[PDB]
Amino acid sequence: IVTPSGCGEENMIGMTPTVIAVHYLDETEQWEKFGLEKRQGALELIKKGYTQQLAFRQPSSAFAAFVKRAPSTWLTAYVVKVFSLAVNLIAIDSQVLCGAVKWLILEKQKPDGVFQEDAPVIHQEMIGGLRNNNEKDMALTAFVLISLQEAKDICEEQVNSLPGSITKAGDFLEANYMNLQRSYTVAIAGYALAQMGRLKGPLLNKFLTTAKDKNRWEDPGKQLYNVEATSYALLALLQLKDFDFVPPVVRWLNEQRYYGGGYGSTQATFMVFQALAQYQKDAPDHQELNLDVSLQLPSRSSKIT
Amino acid sequence: DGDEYFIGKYKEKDETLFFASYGLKRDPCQIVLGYKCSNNQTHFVLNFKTNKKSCISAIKLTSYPKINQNSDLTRNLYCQTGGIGTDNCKLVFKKRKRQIAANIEIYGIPAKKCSFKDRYIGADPLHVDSYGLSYQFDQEHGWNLERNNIFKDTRFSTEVFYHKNGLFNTQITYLAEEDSFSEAREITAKDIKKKFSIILPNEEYKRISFLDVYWFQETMRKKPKYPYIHYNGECSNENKTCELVFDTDELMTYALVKVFTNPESDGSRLKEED
Amino acid sequence: SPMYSIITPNILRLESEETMVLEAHAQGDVPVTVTVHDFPGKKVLSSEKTVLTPATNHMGNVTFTIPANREFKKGRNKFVTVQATFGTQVVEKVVLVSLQSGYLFIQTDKTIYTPGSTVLYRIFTVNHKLLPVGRTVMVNIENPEGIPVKQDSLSSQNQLGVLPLSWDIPELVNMGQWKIRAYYENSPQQVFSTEFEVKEYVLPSFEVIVEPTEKFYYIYNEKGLEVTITARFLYGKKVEGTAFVIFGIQDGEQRISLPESLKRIPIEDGSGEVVLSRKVLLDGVQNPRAEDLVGKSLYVSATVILHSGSDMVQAERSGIPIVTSPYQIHFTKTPKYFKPGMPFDLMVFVTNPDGSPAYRVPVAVQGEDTVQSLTQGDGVAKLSINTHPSQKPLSITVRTKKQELSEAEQATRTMQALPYSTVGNSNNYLHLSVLRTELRPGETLNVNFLLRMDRAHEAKIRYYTYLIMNKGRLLKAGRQVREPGQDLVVLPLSITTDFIPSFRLVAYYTLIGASGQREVVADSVWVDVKDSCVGSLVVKSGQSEDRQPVPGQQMTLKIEGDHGARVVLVAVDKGVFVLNKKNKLTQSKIWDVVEKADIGCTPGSGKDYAGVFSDAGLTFTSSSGQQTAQRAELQCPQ
Ligand SMILES: *[C@@H]1O[C@H](CO)[C@@H](O[C@@H]2O[C@H](CO)[C@@H](O[C@@H]3O[C@H](CO)[C@@H](O)[C@H](O)[C@@H]3O)[C@H](O)[C@H]2NC(C)=O)[C@H](O)[C@H]1NC(C)=O
Ligand SMILES: *[C@@H]1O[C@H](CO[C@@H]2O[C@H](CO)[C@@H](O[C@@H]3O[C@H](CO)[C@@H](O)[C@H](O)[C@@H]3O)[C@H](O)[C@H]2NC(C)=O)[C@@H](O)[C@H](O)[C@H]1NC(C)=O
C-alpha cells in the first residue's frame, strides 16, 4: 500500500502495488486476514490516483507524464491493460480507452503490423525488459498485442481494425519466433502467440529445449525476469490446459517468496500476480474426470450404462 | 449395437442435462429427479424440464434390442412442446413390440452463447449441407439435383420438405455450381414469434441467388403440419434489400439460414415445367 | 453534535429476515437509506428507506431481507458489506453470511431395523425461526463402512416443511450403524445426521431397569452399594423370574469385569435387592488405595430370564459415579468477568455429578457468613457478593453447608474472573440481573435495570434502550426513560411464547467520557426460559378413560394444536426403545440444536464493549470510528 502521488509516470509507480494486491486478494478469496474493509481505503486511494491520471488527459484520448508530451506506445498499452483489468470494482471511462486503442492501432503501427514507439519514457526503472536494445521492436509489438487482446472484450464496438491488427501481429510474429536470443522474450512471445492459439509444434521446442534447465530463463541481473518468464509459461500452459509441466513450476515458484520491493520491480510483480490470478480462476481443485462405464450381460439384452 | 435416434447434433465438448435408463415395459416409470412419464402400448412421453440456466442442444435415445428397420422412413423422436434450444421439451417416442428398454441422455449448453452456428456448418459447406450429404448436380442445365434416400413430403406443386435427425429442411429454389457461398444467419428463441420476416443484402456481389432453411419445430401429432413459407414480392436488382416472411401453423424453436450469391444471376430460377 | 450508530446482528442468513436499529442523539425528520451489496467488490443486493420520527426518539424498527441469490458460491467463506446513509453521512460494516439457512430434523419411525424391511423418515426443514420453509435437499444413505448406497435430491416447495422419504433394506446387507445425511442444496457443509441400527433381532416382552437406592457411590460406605431390579412388562405388569447381575468399571476405552461379583437373584414380584460388598470391589482391582477410583464410574449389567426361559433382556445402567462429594458445581451459565463495586451475582449450577440437577441444597463461601440459598426445580441457586472496587481479580469457590453430612464432602473449584476494562476509568457499569424463578409463557417478569454511575453525570442519561436477541436475531427493541434521582427501575415484561428457549437482554445508552468525547456503556445478561413448545401441541384420548384398550379396537384420538398447522403422527412400539433407545427426537434435542447453533456461548460482559457485543452477538459501528471484531466460523471456540 503506497500513497499515489507525483506526475503521470509517478502515479503508476505509486498506486500499482495497491492495485495488484487488491486484485490478487479479490481473486484468491484471502480477504479474511487482510484488514476487514481495508479494501475501502485501498480503492479510495486507487480512485484518487485514477483521477490524478485523468487530470493529465490529452486530446488523443491517451495518458502520459506531461500534458504537452506525446504519449508513449508502451505506456499507453500498459495503462490500457491496467485499466482493463480493473473493470469490476469502479467505473472506468469507456470512450477514452477506445480512442487510445484506436490511436495505438491506426497511428502507432506500421502497415505491416509492427508497432513502433517514438518517445521513450522519462524514467529508467519501469522499462523492465526493454533496457537491452536488441529486440525492442518485436517485444513492443508483442506487449501491445497482449494489451490490445486484453482490452478487446469491451472496445470492440468502437474499433473495427482491431481484429485485423491482431491477425497481422500474430502472422508476423509466427515467423519471427525462430530468431530470438534472450530467453524471457522467447517466453513472452510464446505466451502472446498462445493467447490466440498460434503456438504449436516446433515453437514449443524452443520453449522446452532452448530454455536453460527447462525451468529458469535466467539473464545477467534482473532476477525478476525469471519469475516473469515463469508466469508466461504458466499462462501458456493454462491456455493449452496441460497439467504435465504446471505443478513442478508452481512448486518452484513458492521457493522464492518474493513480494516486490526494489528498483523498478513493479511491472513484473503485476504480471506474475495477474498470471497467478488467472491460474487460480481457471484451474479446478482436481483434474478432469467424466467416466461413462457400461456393462453387458449374456443373459440381458439391454446395455447397463 | 442398439437403435440410436437423434435430435440435433452431438457435441463432444459439452455436458449432459441428465442421463437415465428407462424400462419401456414399466407401468408407469420411475420419476427420476422429478420428471414425469406417460407410457402406453404405442407411445412413451417424457415431460422433462430442467432447473438450470441452459438450453437443450441435443437428444439421443438408444433402444434395445436392435431391430433392422431404417430410421429415415418415418419419424420416431420429437419434442411435442418446446424442443432444441429451449430449457425443456415434452419428448415423445413411439415404441415397438420388440423394444423393451431405452437409454435417454439429454445435453444442454449455457444460455449465454446458446447458438448452433458452430456445429451445423462444418468445415466446407460448399459441397456438404447440414445433413452431411454431398451435393449432386445434373448436366442438363448445370444445376443441382434431388435426393431420395430420406423422409420427404409435399403439399403443393414444387414444394420441398425434408426431415432428418429432427431437422426440417427446405430449399428455395435451386442452386448453381458456380455460385459462391457468402455467409449465414441464425435466429434465437427470444427473436421468434408466430410470424416474422428477414432482410438480406441484394447489391453488388451480394445478389441473392439461392436460400435454404433448416429449423426445429413442434408437433401436435405424428404427422406434422408444415409452415407455409412463401416469398413475398420479387428479389429484383432494383430493390436493394430483399425480404422474406414466414407464416407458421406451429411455433418454431430454432432457425438457420444460409446465403448464396451470384452477381450474374437474373433473380429468377424455375425449370421449364408447368 | 448529532450522533448516529448502527445496530446489526453478528450473523445473517440467506433467505430470511434481518433487523437493524438506528438511533439519533438530532431531532427532526431525517430519512435513512440502507443498502446491502455483496463483498468483495461492489456488484446491488437490496436497498430500503425509512424516515425517523422525532416524537418517537428515533428508534430503528427497520428490517431488510437479503436476496435469494445464486452466484454466491469452492474456496473460502464470504462476507457482505452493509451500508447506511442518513442523507449526509455514510457508515458501512462487514458482516458474515451463513450457509446454515435452517435446520433439518430427520426423524425415523424406529431406531433398529431388520434386513428386509423399510426405513421411513421425515425431513422437517425449518428456518432459524423454527418455521417451515421451501428449499432443496440432498439426502445420502451411508453404509456402516462410510460410503453412500443411495442418494436423492428433493424439493420442499409448497410442502409445509414435511419431506417424507423411504428406503428399502436389502435382504443381503451389512449389519451395523447405518446413516442418513441430509443437507440443503446450497450448503454442502450443512450435513445433518441420523444413525439407526440394522440388526437381526426380535421383540423383547418386558423392560428391566436397574436402579440404585443412592444414585451415586461413596468410597467410605460401610454397608455396600444397593441396587434394585424393576422388571416390568412393556404393558406395565409384574414378572416372576430370575436375574443375573454383574458389575465392572468404565475406564478409558475399555471394560474390566469382575467375575467375583457375578450374582444371581430371584425377581420377587417385579422386585430385586442386590448388594455389592466393598470387599469384592476392592479385590476386583489391585490398587492399595481406594481413592484412586475417584474419576472413574461403575456399570451394572443385568440379564433377566423368565420362569418360562423365553425372553432375554440384557439391560445396563452404565455410569454409576464414585465420588467423594455427591454434589458438583458448574460455571456454565455464569459469566467469567466480575464487576468491581457493583454486586456481582453468580449463577450457581449444583448437580448430581452426572448432570441431573440437585434440589434443596445451599451454597456457602469461605469468607462470607450467614449467606445461603435453596435450589429450585431447574437446579440453579442464587447469591450476591460485593466486589472489591479496585482492580484486584476475584477468585472464589462454592461450598455446601448441607446438614446431616460431613464437612469433608463439600466440593470446591477455583474460578478465574477478569476485571472489565472501563474506558477512561469512569467506573460506569451495567447489570441486567433478573430474579431467578420459573419462567412460563403468559407471565410477567420484573426485569431489573441495575445502575451504577457517578453523581457528576448520572442525571444526563435520559433513557435506556433494550434489545432482545433470541435465536441470533433482534427479537424486540424498546426504550425506558430514566429521570434523575432513580437508581433502580423495573420493567414488567409480559413474557410471551416467542422468548423460548432464552433471550439475551442487552442494553445500551450514550455517554461522554470526561471531555466532549463519545462513549457507549452497554451490557447483556443471559436469561433462560422453561423449555416448552412455542405452540401448544398435546395428544390424548377423546374417551373418558372408562376401561383399558383391547387389541383390534378403535379409539378416537384427540389432538390439540395451532391453526394452520400440519401434524404428523408416528406410532411405534416401546420394544425398539428396549433394544435401542438412542437417537430419539425430543423438543429438548431441538432446543439444544438451536443453542449449539446460537450466536452466543459466553454469558456476556466481555473485556470491553466490543467484547460485550461479541458475547451478545452484535455489531456496532458509528462515524466516530469505533468498531468491533469479526468471526468467521459457525460455532463458538472450544
Ligand atoms: C396411448 O397413450 C398416449 C399417451 O402416452 C396417447 O397419446 C395422447 O392421446 C391424447 C388423447 O388422444 C392426446 O390428447 C389430445 O390433447 C389435445 C390438446 O388440445 C386435444 O385437443 C385432443 O383432443 C386430445 O385430447 C395427447 O396429445 C396424446 N399424446 C401424444 C404425445 O400424442 C394415446 O392416445 C394412447 N393411445 C390409446 C389410448 O389408444
Ligand atoms: C422491393 O420493393 C418493391 C416495391 O415495394 C412494394 O410495392 C409498393 C411500390 O411498388 C410499395 O409501396 C406501395 O405503393 C403503392 C402504389 O403503387 C401504394 O398504393 C401503397 O400504399 C404502398 O405505399 C409497397 O409498400 C411494397 N410492398 C408491397 C407488398 O406492395 C417490391 O415489389 C419488391 O418485391 C421488393 N423486393 C424484394 C421484396 O426483394
Domains in chain A, CATH or no CATH each: 8-282 (1.50.10.20)
Backbone dihedral angles phi then psi of residue A50, each to the nearest 5 degrees: -65, -40
What's A104's DSSP letter? I
What is the C-alpha end-to-end distance of chain C, expressed in Å? 43
CB contact under 8 A, B21 and A301: no
Cβ contacts of C93 on chain A, cutoff 8 Å: 37
What residue in A sits closest to C42 (Cα-Cα)? A89
**Ligand nearest the Cα atom of residue B211:** 2
Q: Of C131, C142, C62, C145, which is closest to residue C101 (Cα–Cα)? A: C131
Residue to probe by mutation, ligand 2, list B208, B211, B230, B239, most atoms within 8 Å of CB: B239
Chain B residue nearest residue A304, CA to CA: B21
CA angle C478, C484, C486 (to 5 degrees): 75
In angstroms, rounded to a whole number, what is the distance separating the alpha carbons of residues B108 and B88? 10
Chain A residues whose beta carbon lies within 8 Å of the beta carbon of residue B64: 301-303
Count of pairs with CB atoms under 8 A, one residue in A, one in C: 26
Closest ligand 1 atom number to CA of residue B90 = 31
How many whole angstroms separate alpha carbon A56 and alpha carbon A73? 16
Residue whose C-alpha cell is 530454455: A211
Is C94's CB within 8 Å of A29's CB?
no
Kind and range of the H or E element at C126? strand C118-127
Query: What are the DSSP calls for A195-250, one per residue?
Result: HHT---THHHHHHHTSSGGGT----SS-THHHHHHHHHHHHHHHHHT--SSHHHHH
Across C471-528, where does the E strand assignment appear? 473-481, 488-495, 502-512, 518-528
CB C468 within 8 A of CB C505: yes
C33, C84 Cβ separation under 8 angstroms: yes
- Provide DSSP, chain B: --EEEEEE---TTSEEEEEEEEETT-SS----SS-EEEE-SS-EEEE----SSEEEEEEEEEEES-----TTSS--EEEEEE-TTSS-EEEEE---SS--EEEEEEEEEESTT---TTTSS-S-TTTB-TTSPBP-EETTTTEE----SSEE--SSTT---EEETTEEEEEES--BSS-EEEEEEEE-GGG--SEEEEEEE-SGGG-EEEEEEEEEE--SSSS----EEE--S---SSSSEEEEEEE-SS-EEEEEEEEEE-TT--S----S--
Helix, strand, coil share of chain C (percent; to 5): 10, 40, 50
Task: Report residue C549 CA to chain centroid gap.
Answer: 38
Cβ contact C177:C184 at 8 Å: no
Which protein residue's CA is at the shortest distance from atom 8 of ligand 2?
B233
Q: What atom of ligand 1 comes closest to residue B41's alpha carbon?
A: 1
The residue among C377, C381, C490, C489 whose CA lies nearest residue C440 is C377
CB distance B80 to ligand 1 below 6 Å: yes
Q: In whole angstroms, what is the distance from residue C302 CA to residue C208 CA?
A: 8
Cβ within 8 Å of residue C321, ≥6 positions away = C216, C217, C297, C353, C354
CA dihedral of B231, B237, B238, B242, whole degrees rounded to 10: 30
Against chain C, the chains showing at least 3 CB pairs within 8 Å are A
Question: Distance between alpha carbon A54 and the CA centroid of its chain, in Å?
Answer: 22
Helix (H, G, I), strand (E, B) or coil at C231: strand
> Amino acid identity of C209?
I
Phi, psi of B74 (to 5 degrees): -140, -170
Contact at 8 Å (CB) between C139 and C151? yes
Ligand 2, atom nearest to B239 Cα? 1
Question: Which residue, C60, C64, C37, is CA-closest to C48?
Answer: C64
**b (16+ CB within 10 A) / e for A191-211:** bbbbbeebbeeebeebbeeeb
- State yes or no: cis peptide before A247, omega within 30 of 0: no
Q: Which residue, B141, B168, B176, is CA-closest to B260?
A: B176
| C391, containing H or E segment | none
Residue C292, classified by CB atoms within 10 Å of its CB into exposed (0-12), middle (13-18) or buried (19+), is exposed
Is some CB atom of chain B closer than 8 A to the CB atom of A302?
Answer: yes
Query: Which residues, 6+ apart, have CB-to-CB distance to C108 below 8 Å?
Result: C119, C120, C121, C180, C194, C196
| CA–CA gap between residue C71 and residue C186 (Å, rounded) | 11
Q: Which ligand is nearest to the CA of B222?
A: 1
Q: Do C632 and A25 touch (CB under 8 A)?
A: no
Cα–Cα dist C584/C353, whole Å: 24
Other residues' Cβ atoms within 10 Å of the Cβ of residue C302:
25
Q: Which of B24, B99, B103, B107 to substitute to test the interface with A, most A CBs within 10 Å? A: B103
Which three three-digit cell numbers place residue A95? 470512450
Task: Give the separation between CA B8 and CA B115, rounded to whole angstroms.
Answer: 12
How far apart are alpha carbons A3 and A17 in whole angstroms? Answer: 10
C587 is written with which cell numbers? Answer: 423438543
B182 to chain A, any CB pair closer than 8 A? The answer is no
Put simply, the answer to whether B64 touches A304 (Cβ < 8 Å) is no
| Chains in contact with chain A (at least 3 beta-carbon pairs closer than 8 A) | B, C
Cβ(C165)–Cβ(C156) under 8 Å?
no
CA distances from A155 to A51, A160, A164, C65 (A): 21, 9, 14, 38
**Which segments of C420-546 does DSSP mark as H helices, in order?**
none
Phi, psi of C376 (to 5 degrees): -90, -170
Cβ B36 under 6 angstroms from ligand 1: no
Q: What is the DSSP letter of C219?
A: T
Resolution in units of Å:
3.2
For residue B84, give the nearest of B129, B44, B114 by alpha carbon: B114
Instruction: Tell whether A175 is within 8 A of chain B (Cβ).
Output: no
Question: Terminal CA-to-CA distance of chain B, rounded, Å?
Answer: 48
In the chain, the amino acid numbered C102 is G
Q: Inter-chain contact B101–A305, Cβ cutoff 8 Å?
A: no
For the record, the C-alpha cell of C239 comes out as 414378572
H or E element, residue A51: helix A38-55
Report the distance separating Cα C5 and Cα B229, nearest Å: 69
* DSSP per-residue letters across C294-327: TT-EEEEEEEEEETT----EEEEEEEEEB-SSS-
Instruction: Report the alpha-carbon distance of residue C524 to residue C362 in Å, rounded.
Output: 27
C-alpha cell at C56: 418517537
Nearest to C129, CA basis, from C472, C532, C633, C585: C472
In the block, cell 536494445 appears at A133
* Residue type at A139 in one-letter notation: A
